[PDB]
Each structure stands twice: as C-alpha cells, then as structure tokens.
Amino acid sequence: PNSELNIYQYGGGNSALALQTDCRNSDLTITQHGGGNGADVGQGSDDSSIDLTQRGFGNSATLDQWNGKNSEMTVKQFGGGNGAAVDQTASNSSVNVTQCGFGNNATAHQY
Amino acid sequence: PNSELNIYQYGGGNSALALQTDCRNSDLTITQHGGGNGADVGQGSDDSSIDLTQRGFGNSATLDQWNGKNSEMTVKQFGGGNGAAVDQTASNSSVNVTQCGFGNNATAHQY
Amino acid sequence: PNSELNIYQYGGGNSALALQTDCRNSDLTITQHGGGNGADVGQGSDDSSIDLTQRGFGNSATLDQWNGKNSEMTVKQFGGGNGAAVDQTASNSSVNVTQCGFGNNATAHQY
Amino acid sequence: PNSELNIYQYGGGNSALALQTDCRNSDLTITQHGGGNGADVGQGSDDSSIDLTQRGFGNSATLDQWNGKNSEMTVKQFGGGNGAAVDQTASNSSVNVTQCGFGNNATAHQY
Amino acid sequence: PNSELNIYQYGGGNSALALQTDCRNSDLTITQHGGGNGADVGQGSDDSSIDLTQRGFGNSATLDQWNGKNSEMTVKQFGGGNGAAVDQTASNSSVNVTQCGFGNNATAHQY
Amino acid sequence: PNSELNIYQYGGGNSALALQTDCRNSDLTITQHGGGNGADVGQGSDDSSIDLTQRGFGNSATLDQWNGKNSEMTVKQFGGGNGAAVDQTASNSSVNVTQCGFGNNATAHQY
Amino acid sequence: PNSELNIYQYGGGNSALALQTDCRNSDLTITQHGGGNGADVGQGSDDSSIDLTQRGFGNSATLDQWNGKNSEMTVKQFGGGNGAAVDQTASNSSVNVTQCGFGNNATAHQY
Amino acid sequence: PNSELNIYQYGGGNSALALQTDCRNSDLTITQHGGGNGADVGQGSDDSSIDLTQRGFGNSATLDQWNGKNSEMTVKQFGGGNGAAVDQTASNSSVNVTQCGFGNNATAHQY
C-alpha cells in the first residue's frame, strides 16, 4: 500500500492543507506557482489519484475524494481568483477541472 | 463505472457548475469559449452523454439528465445571450439543441 | 425509444418553446431564421414528426400533436407576421401548412 | 494505513519538499512561518513521525526518514539562514534539532 | 532503542557536528551559548551519554564515543577559544573535561 | 570498574593531560587554580587514587601511577613555578609532595 | 606497607631529591627553610625513618639508608653552607647530626 | 645496637671527621665552640664513648677508639691551637686529655 502525497510550493503567499487517510495505493500532488493560492485537499479512496496544480494568483481550492476506488481527479487553475470545489465518491470515475482566466467559479460533484 | 466530467474554460468570466451522480459509464463535458457564459449541468443517467459547448458571450444554459439510459445530450450556443433549459429523462433518447445569434430562448423536454 | 427534439435559431429575438412527452420514436424540429419569430410546439404522438420552419420576421406558430400515431406535421412560414395554429390528433395523417407573404393567418384541425 | 502529510506555509517565498512512500501509519508535518525557508523531507519508515518547524526567513533543513520503524524526528529552526541535515534509518529512535538565531548549521545522522 | 540527540544553540555563529549511529538507548546533548563555538561529536555506543556545554566564544571540542557501553562523557567549556579533544571507547567508563578561561587545550583518550 | 577522572581548572591558560587505562575502581582528580599551570598525569593502577592540586601560576608536575594496587598519589603545589616529578609503581604505597613558594623542584620515586 | 615521603620547602631556590624503594613501613621527611638548600636522600630500609631539616641558606646534605631495619636518621642544619653526608646500613641504629653556623662539614658512616 | 653519633658545631670554619663502624651500643659526641677547629674521630669500640669538646680557635684532635669494650675517651681542649692525638684499644679503660691555653700538644696511647 503505497500512498504518496506531494506538496510543491513556488512563489509567495501560497498555503496548503493536505489529507490522506485509509487510502491505499493513492497519489495526491499539490503544486503551487505564483501567489496567494490556498489549498485544502482530502483523499480517502483506494487506488485513486488527486492532482492539484495552481499557477497564478489568488486561486482557492477545496478537493475531497472519499470512499471511491480507481478514481482520478484533476484540478488545474491558471490565472487569478478562480475558486474550485470538487467532491468525488464514485468508483472507477474521473473528474477533470481546469479553469483559465479571472474570477471563474467551478463546482464538481461525482457520486 | 467509467464516468468522466470535463470542464475546459477559455476566456474570462465564465461560470460552470457540474453534477454527476449514480452515473455509470457516462461522460459529461463542459466547454466555454468567450466570456460571461453561465452553466449548470446535472447528469444522473447510465450510459449517457452530455456535451455542452459555449462559444460567444453571455449565454446561459441549464441541463438535467436524470433516470435515463443510453441517452445523449448535445447543447451548443453560438453568439450572445442565448438561454436554454433542457430536461431529459427518457431512455434511449437524444436532444440536440443549438442556438446561433443573439437573445434566443429554447426549452426542451423529453420524458 | 429514439425520440429527438431539435431547435435551431439564426438571427436575433427569436423565441421557441418546445414540449414533447410520452412521445416515443419521434422527432421535434424547430428552425427559425430572421428575427422576432415565436414558436410553441407540443408533441405527444407516437412514431410522429414535427417540422416547423420560420424564415423572416414576426412569424408565430402554435403546434400541438397529441394522442396520434404515424402522423406528420410540416408547418412553414416565409415572410412577416404570419400566424399558424394547428392541432392534430388523427393517426396515420398529415397536415401541411405553408404561408408566403405578410400577415397570413391559417388554422388547421385534424382529428 | 492512515498516512498523513501536512505542510503549512504562512508568509511568502517559502519552499518545502515532502515525500512519503512505503510509509504506513505515519505522519509528516511541515510548518513554515515567515519567508524564504527551505525544506526537503523524505519519509519511508513505518509507524514514524516527522515534525519540521521553520519560523523566520531563509532557513534550510534536509530531512530523510527511511527504512525505520517507530521513529520520531523533530527539527525546530528559529531565526534566519539556519541549516540542519538529518537522516534517520534507526528504528524506535529520535533526533531533536533546535536552531535559534542566524546562520546556524548542525547535522545529525542516525542509523 | 530509545535514542535521543539534542542540540541547543543560543546566539550567533555557533556550529556543532553530531553523529549517533548503531547507538541504542543513548543521549547526545549539545548546548552552545554565545558565538563562534565549534563542536564535533560522534556517538556509536550503547546505553551511553554525551553532554557538551559550550558557553562563551570560539570554543572547540572534538568528541567521539565509539563501541563502548554504559559510558558517560562530559565536556564543559567556559570562556574563549578553548579546545578539548576526547575519544572514548571503553565500556562502563566516564570522561570529564572542564575548561575555564582562554586558549585552554586538554586532550583525553580512554580505551 | 568504576573509574572516574576529574579535571577542574579555574582562571586562564592552565594545561593538564590525564590518561586512565586498565585502571579499575580508581579516581583521577586534578585541580588547577590560577593561570598557566601545566600537568601530565597518567594512571594505570587498580584501586588507586591521584590527587594533584596546583594553586597559583606556572606550576609544573608530572605524575605516573602504573601497575600499582591500593596506592594514593598526592601533590600540592602552592605559589609559582613549582616543578615536581613523581613515579609510583609499588602497591599499597603513598607518595605525598607539598611545594610552597616559588621555583620549587621535587622528585619522588616509589617502586 | 604504609610508606610515605614528605617534602616541605619554604622560600625560594631550594632543591631536594628523594628516592624510596623496597622500603616498607618507613618515613622520609625533608623540611627546607630559606633558600638554596640542596638535599639528596635515598632510603632502602624497612620500618626506618629519615628526618632532614635545613633552615638557612646554601646547606647541602646527602643521606642514605640501605638494607637496615629499625633505624632512625636525623640531620638538623641551621645557618649557611653546611655540608652533611651520612650512610647507614646497620639495623636498630641512629645517627644524629646537628650543624649550626657557617661552612660546617660533617660526615657519618655507621655499618 | 643503639649506637649514636653526634656532632655539635657553633661558629664558623669548624670541621669534623667522624666514623663509627662495627661499634654497637656506643656514643660518639663532638662539640666545637668557636672557629677553625678540626676534629678526626674513629670509633669501633663496643659499649664505649668518646667525648670531644673543643672551645676556641684552631684546635685539632685525632681520636681512635678501636676493638675496645667498655672504654671511655674524653678530650677537652680550651683555648687556641691545641693539638691532641689519642689511640685507645684497651677494654675497660679510660683516657682523659685536658688542654688549656695556647699551643698545647698532648699524645696518649692506651693498649
């Protein structure tokens, strides 16, 4: 059971919360480029992947993948002030979020 | 159940909210080109597809895929300020909604 | 049941409402060219087809196909301000309404 | 395998790398307060904990916990430009690093 | 094997080098007060202790405790520029170094 | 074997060399008060003690306790520039040297 | 064998050389008061005593106990430049030498 | 064998030569008052005594007591430049020499 959590933070003013529990063979990566991006990621699913990359300024993300299996979730934010929340509990399922520009709001739920 | 939810944003000021639940072997894709388009997509149908594409400005869409099976959704806006709302519950059914121009309103239902 | 609802707008200020229920293996098609054309189409007929084409300005059509089977409705306005109201319940029947010019009014009923 | 990795950055310009694999039931905690602090932490040890606290600016610590069991590693850097390098492979073992001030360099290896 | 390594540095410009390997149930403590103090301490001895206290400036002590058991090594440097070099390999043995003043040099070997 | 070696230095510039090997259940104590005191003391005798007290400045003494048993070694140098050389090898023997004043030299041998 | 050597020197420039070997339960006391007194005392006699007291300046004494038993050896030199040479081998014997003044020479042999 | 040899010199320039060998239970006493007085005394006589008293300047005495038993030897020289030569070998014998004044010469033999 290899669980991997990576937090890559470049620039100034980025802040991160990352959480894995009961998630076997799961990968969760946080990469922040720029400034002021705040991150909160929860992973509790086996054989699942969470990939959160922030490039820009002022983006905020809340990401929860629970009780799933063989699930891939991706959130990529480019630009400024974009806010994302992703909840994924479906098994063998994928959620992909990519927001480019300013002030974009995205909410994704997969059960 | 291989379920994919895709949000691709190009431009500035677009907003999207996506819902996919109890949804086996189906795809939900939201693509916006331009600015200020607003979207709300709920998909709960097995072996189904929703394709919502916005190219232009100020278009508004609401899409609901519920309790169906083997159903297809393709909803397209070209231009400005087009507003569409579609409810589809029929199985083995498809609704293909397109607007070209400005200020067009379309309502579609399938049961 | 392969049932399709189609709405196409070209121009500006056109409005179309389409409702189709209990209508199996049937097509709903609306095409509006120009501006200010208004459409209200109800389809509840099995193995039936509705084709409404408005080309021009200010044309209005109210179309209802209920309880029929193997029925076809083709309503076409060319010009300005033409008004059509057609109600069809007969099975294995076809009504074809065509208006050319300005201010034409046509009512068709088939039972 | 409840394996948790937390990294907290408050301020701007901090850099931290955290790596957890082959590491069951283990916690890796990074807390960076200020700006420009550097951290590289690798964790591959069972039932182990890593705690890193950098408070100030420009501090450096390179931290490796591999192959160990029931092992705790603590480093607390207070001030500016402080350097500590700690490798841990010993089981049931602890290393405590406490740097206060500017330009401090102290290295510990535990096997 | 509850083995603890502690370093306490107060002031600026102090350097200490500590090594604890294969070293079960043992403690290594370094306490530097002032500035520019240097210490090199290696510990490879079971159930052993190393206590080093440097208070002042420019003090240097090079300490090695290897292959011993139940061994205690104490060095206390008070003042400036003091040097003590001690190697301890004997088991159930104790070394005491006490330097007060400036430029003191005392060397101890215990086998 | 409880073998404990003590060096106490008060002032600045005092120098002392102490060596304890194969010397079981023995105490090695050196006391230097003042400045510039030089001492070389080697102890390899079981159940033996060496007590060296230098109070003043520039005192020099060489003490060797080898191969003895139940032997006590005492040297007291008070004043300045006192020089004493003592070798003790006999068992159950005591050597006592007291120097008071300046420029004293004393040699004592016990076999 | 409780055998002790005592050397007491008060002032400056006094020199005393003492050897005790093979000599059980025996005493040697050297007391030098003043300056420039020279003493050479060798003892090899069981349960024997040597008492040398030099008070003044430039006094010289050479004292030898070898192979005797129950022997007592005394010289008291008061004044300046006194010279005493005593060799003792007999058992149960005592020689008392007392020099007061300047330039005294006294030699004692007892076999 | 309590055999005790005593020299008492007062003043400056007095010289004494004394030898006591094979001489058990006998006393050797030499007393010089003044200056430049010379003494040569050899004692090898059992249970015997030699009492030599020189008071003055430049007095000379040579005394030999050999092979005798229970023999007493008295020389009292008062004044200046007195010379006495006495050989005593007889047992149970007493020789008395008394010189007062200047330049006295006394020779005594007892066999």
Rounded distance, CA F53 to CA F65, Å?
A: 16
What tokens appear for B44 in the block? 């709960």
* DSSP characters over H45-102: EET-EEEEEEEEES-EEEEEEEEEES-EEEEEEEEES-EEEEEE--TT-EEEEEEEEE
Where residue H70 falls (left for φ over 0; alpha for ψ -120 to 50; beta otherwise) is: left
Q: How far is F75 from chain G (nearest CA, A)?
A: 10
User: Does A17 contact D at CB distance below 8 Å?
Assistant: yes
Q: How many other CB atoms are there within 10 angstroms of residue H105's CB atom? A: 11
* DSSP characters over chain D: ---EEEEEEEEBS-EEEEEE-S--S-EEEEEEEEES-EEEEEEEEET-EEEEEEEEES-EEEEEEEEEES-EEEEEEEEES-EEEEEE--TT-EEEEEEEEES-EEEEEE-
User: Does G16 contact F at CB distance below 8 Å?
Assistant: yes
Q: Please tell me which chains touch B, using 3 or more CB pairs under 8 Å as the contact test.
A: A, C
Phi and psi angles of residue H48, each rounded to the nearest 5 degrees, phi first: -125, 165
Rounded distance, CA A96 to CA A84, Å?
A: 11
User: Does A85 contact B at CB distance below 8 Å?
Assistant: no
Rounded distance, CA E39 to CA E44, Å?
A: 17
User: Resolution for this model in angstroms, one decimal place?
Assistant: 3.8
Across the interface, whether the CB atoms of A110 and B3 are under 8 A apart is answered: yes
Q: Note whether H touches A: 3 CB pairs or more under 8 A.
A: no
Across the interface, whether the CB atoms of H5 and G95 are under 8 A apart is answered: yes
User: Does G98 contact H at CB distance below 8 Å?
Assistant: yes
Q: How many other CB atoms are there within 10 angstroms of residue E73's CB atom? A: 27
Q: How many other CB atoms are there within 10 angstroms of residue C92's CB atom? A: 10
Which run of H or of E encompasses A91? none
Half-sphere exposure of G7 (CA within 13 A, CB side): 35
User: Does A29 contact B at CB distance below 8 Å?
Assistant: no
* Strand-pair partners of G92: none
Which residues of chain A neighbour D19 with C-beta distances below 8 Å?
4, 6
Across the interface, whether the CB atoms of H3 and G103 are under 8 A apart is answered: no
Q: How many other CB atoms are there within 10 angstroms of residue A99's CB atom? A: 26
Q: How many other CB atoms are there within 10 angstroms of residue H107's CB atom? A: 11
Rounded distance, CA G60 to CA G77, Å?
A: 9
User: Does A31 contact D at CB distance below 8 Å?
Assistant: no
What tokens appear for D109 in the block? 């290896």
Q: Which residue of D has its CA nearest to E24?
A: D93
Residue from E84, E6, E74 nearest E39 by CA: E84
Residue with tokens 């690798």: D42
Rounded distance, CA D32 to CA C34, Å?
A: 63
Which residues of chain E neighbour F11 with C-beta distances below 8 Å?
100-101
Three state DSSP letters for chain G: CCCEEEEEEEEECCEEEEEECCCCCCEEEEEEEEECCEEEEEEEEECCEEEEEEEEECCEEEEEEEEEECCEEEEEEEEECCEEEEEECCCCCEEEEEEEEECCEEEEEEC
Q: How far is D7 from chain E (nearest CA, A)?
A: 24
Rounded distance, CA A110 to CA C47, Å?
A: 36
Strand pairing class (F72-80; E15-20): unpaired
Rounded distance, CA C80 to CA C35, Å?
A: 10
Residue with tokens 């330049």: H103
Rounded distance, CA H38 to CA B19, Å?
A: 135
Q: Which residue of F has its CA nearest to G24?
A: F93
Across the interface, whether the CB atoms of A20 and D4 are under 8 A apart is answered: yes
Which residues of chain E neighbour F20 with C-beta distances below 8 Å?
93, 110
Which residues of chain F neighbour G5 with C-beta distances below 8 Å?
95-97, 108, 110
Rounded distance, CA C5 to CA B55, Å?
A: 22
* B9 CB-near residues (< 8 Å, 6+ apart): A98, A99, A100, A101, A104, A106, B16, B32
Count of positions (residues) in chain H = 111
Q: Please tell me which chains touch D, using 3 or more CB pairs under 8 Å as the contact test.
A: A, E
Across the interface, whether the CB atoms of E22 and D94 are under 8 A apart is answered: no
Per DSSP, E67 falls in state E
Which residues of chain E neighbour D107 with C-beta distances below 8 Å?
17-18
Buried b (16+ CB within 10 A) or exposed e, F64-75: bbbebeebbbbb
Per the CB < 8 A criterion, the answer to whether G103 and H13 are in contact is yes
Rounded distance, CA F42 to CA F45, Å?
A: 9
Q: How many other CB atoms are there within 10 angstroms of residue C100's CB atom? A: 11
Residue from B58, B49, B94, B97 nearest B75 by CA: B97
Where residue D58 falls (left for φ over 0; alpha for ψ -120 to 50; beta otherwise) is: left
Which residues of chain D neighbour E50 with C-beta distances below 8 Å?
none
Q: How far is A72 from chain B (nearest CA, A)?
A: 9
Indicate the residue of D102, D106, D111 with minimum beta-carbon distance to E21. D111
Q: Which residue of D has its CA nearest to A13?
A: D12
Give how far the C-alpha of residue E37 lies from the chain's centroid of Cα atoms, to the nearest Å: 12
User: Does E111 contact F at CB distance below 8 Å?
Assistant: yes
What tokens appear for C54 in the block? 């408005």
Which run of H or of E encompasses E104? none
Three state DSSP letters for F20-78: ECCCCCCEEEEEEEEECCEEEEEEEEECCEEEEEEEEECCEEEEEEEEEECCEEEEEEE
Q: Is A77 helix (H, G, I), strand (E, B) or coil?
A: strand
Across the interface, whether the CB atoms of D93 and E6 are under 8 A apart is answered: no
Which residues of chain G neighbour F107 with C-beta distances below 8 Å?
17-18
What tokens appear for H48 in the block? 């015997």
Q: Is F111 helix (H, G, I), strand (E, B) or coil?
A: coil
Q: How far is F30 from chain G (nearest CA, A)?
A: 20
User: Does D46 contact A at CB distance below 8 Å?
Assistant: no
User: Does E79 contact F at CB distance below 8 Å?
Assistant: yes
Domain ranges of chain D: 4-110
In the sheet with D60-69, reading across from the earlier edge strand, the strands are D15-20, D38-46, D60-69, D83-88, D105-110, E15-20, E38-46, E60-69, E83-88, E105-110
Per the CB < 8 A criterion, the answer to whether H76 and H84 are in contact is no
Per the CB < 8 A criterion, the answer to whether E45 and E70 are in contact is no
Across the interface, whether the CB atoms of G97 and H7 are under 8 A apart is answered: yes
Per the CB < 8 A criterion, the answer to whether G22 and G45 are in contact is no
Q: Note whether B touches E: 3 CB pairs or more under 8 A.
A: no
Q: What is the largest CA-CA distance in chain A?
A: 39
Half-sphere exposure of D72 (CA within 13 A, CB side): 9
Per the CB < 8 A criterion, the answer to whether B51 and B28 are in contact is no
